[model samples]
Target: SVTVYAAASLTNAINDLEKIYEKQNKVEVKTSYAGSSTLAKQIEAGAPADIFISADTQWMDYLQNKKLVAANDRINLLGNRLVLITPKGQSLNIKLDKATDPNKVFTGKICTGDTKSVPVGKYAKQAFTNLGWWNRIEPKLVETEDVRVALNFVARGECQVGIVYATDAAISKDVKVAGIFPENTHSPIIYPLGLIKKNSNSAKFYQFLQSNQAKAVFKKYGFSMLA
Candidate 1:
């Protein structure tokens, strides 16, 4: 059996991979999903996991610094675009260019993952800064512990708009894509995966994760292969 710690945005894709990997490798695969930062902290604090799939590079580096994973085992798996999202029927016609004007669209909470630690939140903050709007609108930010919560806030109409990965926006019909942040605004978004050194099933688990079978499953859930 192997435990895999992954980001919340990977929930659907990894769930599909888990089913196939477990059957082919004949090893039970358990998954723990949360913000990449939270997962990294848990791994550093001694959480037992056979593999760690981080939504951003920083968390992976954190685990590497702690000597928790095999150096050669790390592989950049996929990439995603960041976007602003809103509920399906909401009339909020806010533009990313107009983000600076608080009263234009930020009348309600603008949901986001925690910028202090969460990868998505960190990216969003960086993107806002790159666009030269963070300082003025920082007050209206509604931070959540995880990206999924922020997504939920938009899906349920609790928030007028949200910032999340495109892969996440693809999962729900309850929400609609607003605008994509230019890649220049933030750090490149890449999800990386690696095998844990202490895992008894490391060899088999690593092989299965990198196999074509896993790639097919990931693609089915809207992840674009990292080139």
Candidate 2:
């Protein structure tokens, strides 16, 4: 049995990964998901995890630097995109390219993950800066623990707009896609997985995660395979 800490964005996929891995490998796969940076901090603080998967390379780097995870066991697993979402029935005279407009659709707040620790927040901020919109709209930004919380804000109309991964937006019908960030706007949204140093069953768990069964389950949730 292995305790796995993963990025929140992979919630659905990992649920299925757990099932399949458990059936085939006969190891109970338990998981915790959150913004990548926060998860990294948890691991650093001695979270008893046998495996770690992150939505961005930054957190993995942090763990690797601390010698918390085995370097050779790490693998870049998949990629996704960033998207802008607004509550249903709300329309904006803006395109994804126009996300920088100071007169952004929402006056209350624009939700995003915490830029200091969350990968989605970092990517969203990068997109804004690359598009020259960061300074102009930072005042309106509402930071959340993870992208899911930001999406929840928009879905509940607590916030008029939200920035989250495209895969995250796929979970709800209450939000409409305002626009998708151009691929070049920020670093690619890559997901990476690895074994933590305390695991005695590392090889067995890593093998199952990389297995075709796991890949198929991940693909169903919109994750590109780690080729």
Candidate 3:
């Protein structure tokens, strides 16, 4: 059996790949999805996770620097885009730029990953800051444990809008894309994959993540292959 601690944003695609990988390799695959910060902190505390796929470089590098994840086993394996999302029934002309104020664009709270920890929220903070909207919008924000949770808030109308990955919005019908944050607005969105343990099952799956088969699944879920 191999245990994978992955970001919440990876749930759908990882779930799909997990079943295929297990059936093809005849290994039991266990996956836990949460914010990368949560997963990294757990691994630092000595959890028995075999593979760690972080939504951002900071957490993966956190483990690597702590010697929890082997430096040589790490790879920046995926990319994604940030998007402004609104509930399906809402009507808003969203524009994200230096001349626009997110605070003026929509009413009610905006949901996002925890800005101090979760990668998606951190990216949102960066993008909003650069757009000159972070300060005015901060008070209306409702940060979640992870990007998927942020998406759920918008989907359920708990929040009027949110900032989450394009893939996060892609998986839900209850939320619709309002505007995409330009790539230059924030640091690049990258997913880094690393091995916490190097047993045969772990090593094989680590390499398998680079295969075209895996790339297909990622692309199907709106992720960009970067291996």
Candidate 4:
């Protein structure tokens, strides 16, 4: 059995990879998807996870500092873009500019992951800070537990605007990406894959994640193959 604790944004691609891997190798695979911070805490609390794929380097480094991850088995596997999204049919024509106020475009609460912990939120915060939008928008923000939850808030019309990964926006038809944040605005978005427990099966699966087959699936879901 191989257990994976991954970021919620990886749900689609990883789930598809799981099916393909299980069919070919007949290895039992169990996956848990949540915010990277939440998943890290779960692992720290003794959750049985063989592989950990973090949405950001920070959480992966958190585990490394604690000596919970196998340093040699880790690799940066993927990259993604942060985007601004609005509910379908809602028009919020705004360009990402350092001088433009985000509140001017959307008056309602802006949805994003919790900036204090979630990777998506952290990236959003970083980008907003660079764009000079954070100070004005911070008061009107609605923080969610994960990027997926932030996507849901916009999709369900609970929030008029949201900040989430481009891959996430691709999965939901109810939300349309209103704008793409410039890469220079935030730290590079990278997904780091690490082994929590070393074993034959886990090692094989970890390598498979870096394979061309996995890259194709990840790209299909809008993730960039960075490894």
Question: Which candidate leads the pack in lDDT?
Answer: 4
Q: Rank the candidate models, highest lDDT first.
A: 4, 3, 1, 2
RMSD of 1: 1.9
Global lDDT of each model?
Answer: 0.83, 0.82, 0.91, 0.93
**If scored against the real structure, what TM-score would every candidate get?**
0.92, 0.92, 0.98, 0.98
lDDT of 1 by residue, 105-209 (tens): 566677889987898999999888887778765888899878898999999998888989998888988888888888888999999988775555866776776
Q: State which candidate, 3 or 4, has the greater lDDT.
A: 4
- The residue-level lDDT of candidate 4 at 207 comes to 94
Model 3 per-residue lDDT tens digits across residues 1-227: 99999999999999999999988988999999999999999999989999999999999989988989777899999999999999999946577789886556866888999899999999999998888887888899899999998999899998898989999888999999999889999999999999899999999999998888999999999999884
Q: Which ten contiguous residues of candidate 1 have the minimum total lDDT?
A: 91-100
Model 3 poorest 10 in a row by lDDT: 99-108
After superposition, the stretches of candidate 3 with alpha carbons farther than 4 Å from their true spots are none
- The TM-score of candidate 4 is 0.98
Candidate 1 TM-score to native: 0.92
**Model 4, span 36-121: residue lDDT tens:** 99999999999999999999999999999999996787899999999999999995667888867666786888999999999999
For residues 1-227, write the lDDT of model 2, one tens digit per residue.
68888898988888887887677765677889888888889989998888888989989989999988767879998888888888988855446575356555546688999887799999988888887777777989899998888888899988888888888888888888888889988999888887885455666877777887777877777778856
Q: Which TM-score value belongs to model 3?
A: 0.98
**Clashing residue pairs, candidate 4?**
none
